[model samples]
Target: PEDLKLHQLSQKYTAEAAKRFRPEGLGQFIRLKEVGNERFRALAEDPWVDHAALNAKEPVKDGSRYKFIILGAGYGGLLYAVRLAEAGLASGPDDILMVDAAGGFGGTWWWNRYPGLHCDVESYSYMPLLEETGYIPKSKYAAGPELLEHAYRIATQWKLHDKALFRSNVKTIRWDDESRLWSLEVTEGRGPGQQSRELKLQARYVLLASGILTNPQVPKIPGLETFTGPVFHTARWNYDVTGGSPTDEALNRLEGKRVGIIGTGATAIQVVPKLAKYAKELYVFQRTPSGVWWRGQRPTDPVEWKTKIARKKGWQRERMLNLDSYLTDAAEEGQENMVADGWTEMPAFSAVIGSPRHGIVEPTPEKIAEHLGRLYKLDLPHAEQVRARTDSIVKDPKTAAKLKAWYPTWCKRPTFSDEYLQTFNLPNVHLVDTDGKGVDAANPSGLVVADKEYPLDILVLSTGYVTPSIGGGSPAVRTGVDIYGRGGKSLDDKWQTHGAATLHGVCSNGFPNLFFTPLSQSSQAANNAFTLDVGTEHIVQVIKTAEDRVDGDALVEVTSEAEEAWSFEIMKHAGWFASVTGCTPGYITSEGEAPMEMAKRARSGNLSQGMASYMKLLQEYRADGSLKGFDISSRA
Candidate 1:
């Protein structure tokens, strides 16, 4: 019905993406912890962990067994512990133990405390268990410090203060058939000048909640190691060089120094404005421009909180699902658009996120093009306005043209900031657009792009994290831990041979009493907090129902037949995400490397009907109370 000029926009997007595609694809970036040079490796070390204090306490015991052991201390891990306690699953204090590689809780919140940092999602729905804690966010989008504090508050409220083992990494997990337990090999690092300790622990049940953005990565630029000036990744922001604490945004140290940042994604969107205030000269190097939208950030009105927001009993979940409904095309005819913002307006994002109404597309060229055409029509107005926003905000016409993003909103993670585009109007701030090719090389004093060198005293690598889609997208590879289940079957091996086979993305066959959050074969959502809560709640129900069925101890695993049935269900909806193959190179598309086989591509597909429908389906399954997919048996 609408004239979106699909043929013209499609050609433009294809040419723009072709300029950014690399033959190496995902291999162009290097993991910070795995870099060859010790200088870059040192940047990956934990700067926020208070090693001396944690080592003195000696929190977790070696060679000790626990009833429940959780990996990662992020919000996902915290949710699992909280839900288990509310369900009366862990009555004893020692029933649950958490292990993490970082110094303390908060996971991503604990690690990322850069200047001008704030959550992209609104805090009310993004922060978990706000109704339970009775905590109101200070602002619409909470800052980094408040987000980290909330993580500690959740642990404290649940009496999970000393229940975690920090600075520890799980190396391997093995399942024993005779013992009916999982053995974990762990390594704990003490503070500087101290030797690391190794421990062996066993657990009746284990949960993998290691988050999506744990490990940071940098571009493999030539001679980046040779840059002797102070450098740091945005994930591990260096306060000493930047002269700003996580709470404060003032950067006195950068007043006289020239600073160059090497990314234009979410982190740089929040950072470039701050650097423009103090730096002698600030250069923002861009490979691809993010779709910048307006963020209506303000203080949360107490009067509105009582009357409009937190008025009811289940307000948080209701608000979360309400937001999900608008994004997924599943909204009821006249539902109130609560939590209304930029996210709710972008209905075309359902191309990657899936939709209830238009999910199951037929796998034919004519049908695929038709589906793509519908999405472009839905996206045209939003896409044009975002470009117009850049034109109006940035004073210089040349700089404004360079800042405009050409791809669909779904191609990259959308960014929001009032000051990001206007920062280009500053006299000292410069935009170094790469025209799709990234930085050519780096030297001790400066960075080179297209034979031009930009001198700098401080370098900020706002580069992204390792994509979870690598290595068959298995949990073992994603978390950097090896897992062997019954008959010593490696989970990695199973994924390589038979692509993702799990019942509801929680448990698989032959892996008794073992559970994890799968990157694939689950319902996908932009707001991670909502998705985490959904997955953990589903897992808790499975555990609670299995325990309720058995006498004392129970072994839970998905049956072989049930797992195959789930896989078949996933493959049927694979056509929902067919448009992703034509998008730009980014973490979501695995740098534009499309799988050749249809089944291979479908293995990574999530629920086509979206998160709202997925939650209802799980609720229906629980009402049946049969635990239909899992095989639960009492252990001797």
Candidate 2:
């Protein structure tokens, strides 16, 4: 076909594909129904039933101290602390303090000790400050331990440990009008032994680097607690039950046990193969079958590492963009290239742009059908290959058949592995496919699937953490603290009018000397680490500007207009403003509800253009003599 003719034909096929590949809204409805009143009531009744709390031995006080106090010792917190110190802003007796629930650094990395826990994102691009620190990851995809170690290395290199307060949980942060400082109260100790203390620290600034996935949320399923065997979530891996640390063998203790795992999300995909290796029988309860792809994970090339390490400054951001551009359909300047190179060389943009070009586009019904057809076409060959591998490895045909995935790949996130399918062929392994209706019930001795009871010696939840949600409770809440600004306006009240109002998704109005690292409102499209780096740079510059421009004891707050404008810009670039529509019910969209206000603002194009564009804009804004859209004042 001629270029123009092909384009026209492609549009027609795109429309046809859209109608054939749209989602049934079945997943969303099921998610909602699953969390209905009954589940809510169950959560309420047993709110503290499964809750676990970790505490520090001593109190963390705020006494006219520290120039900056960072909340949450996660990647965000660790990165900001290092940046501040490196910028020469964090110094003196009390310049900075990194507070986290973990005993040490590596926020999520510290807590998640699952058997096969590893970074799904490429480690080279995912790990922050590698080049600055003059280090190279041992592997292309660094494991949880190494990632966690890198976080500590960053902290140690910057001497952040001197001010870090591990195992400390901030109860509340209240701005003291008279003192011009933040009154931070924190709880010390684990659970019942925990004691509360109030510290009046004079922070010229406070950075909320608390990450999104801090809390682990278990699904409210019937008789979960009633399960008799050892049951635990993947995030809070039970090493005693699992038989070894995350570093060691694959659940070697399960050699004779019948194991059952619920949820076939990202975590399960990684752990299932390992579980199948040891368990005498395995039941994988699945609500949706994830798209399977080949994971060609390998060690880092020394030569390539050397070459890339020399040019690491903007590598992460570039790689992130490469991934996004490939995944989405919006045509960019770059040619189609599979940067990650695992799945079919199919361009993700096809779906993003809509598909008559590939005979895959159409209205909702047609779109859904087309998408299913495409997935089947792409996955069947791989599935057959996997099945063949399963047959080659295992002696049983029934088990292999049960292990095969039949649902459309788009139903869940794509998984990649060479060993997962083959594990099913083992004599000790058994494949129990729930056919999308997860575990029906859990008895004291086993799990019930369609009235067929499969007794398990051990049960692993493998269910992932709660999807990221807006305004979810966290350290900000458990500590019983509220932030008050000028005229005693509550931070919550200021944001109530809009979900979360901020400028460039970093600074909020009325929250003087307060800043939040990147959140959904800002840099939602960029790689998280890259976003944090940009955010930290912005914060450092702001502080420098404040020191130069303001008189002693002056407080700075972002203007209300700036916050609104930035929020609007975020909504604009989101495109189509389809918040939760057609998406599986998760935190990405408010339980599938359209984020009308956010979408409308984003569509208006008033915020930073995009991550890279936003970074350039911010750098220029800071460089300019005039500090636009800001409110500064002296406490005197």
Best by lDDT: 1
Model 2 lDDT tens row, 511-603 = 788877655464443246766778878887777677667644457788888877766555544432221133344344333332465444332
lDDT of each: 0.88, 0.59
- How far is 402's C-alpha from truth in model 2 (Å)? 7.9
Q: List the candidates' TM-scores in order.
A: 0.98, 0.78
Off by over 4 Å in 2: 1-59, 62-64, 190-202, 312-325, 328-339, 343-414, 427-435, 472-482, 551-554, 594-610
Off by over 4 Å in 1: 1-6
443-546 per-residue lDDT for model 1 (tens digits) = 99999999999889999999989987776578888888899999999998888788888888888888888888756788878888899988999998889888
Clashes of each: 0, 50
Which candidate number would show the highest TM-score if scored against the true structure?
A: 1
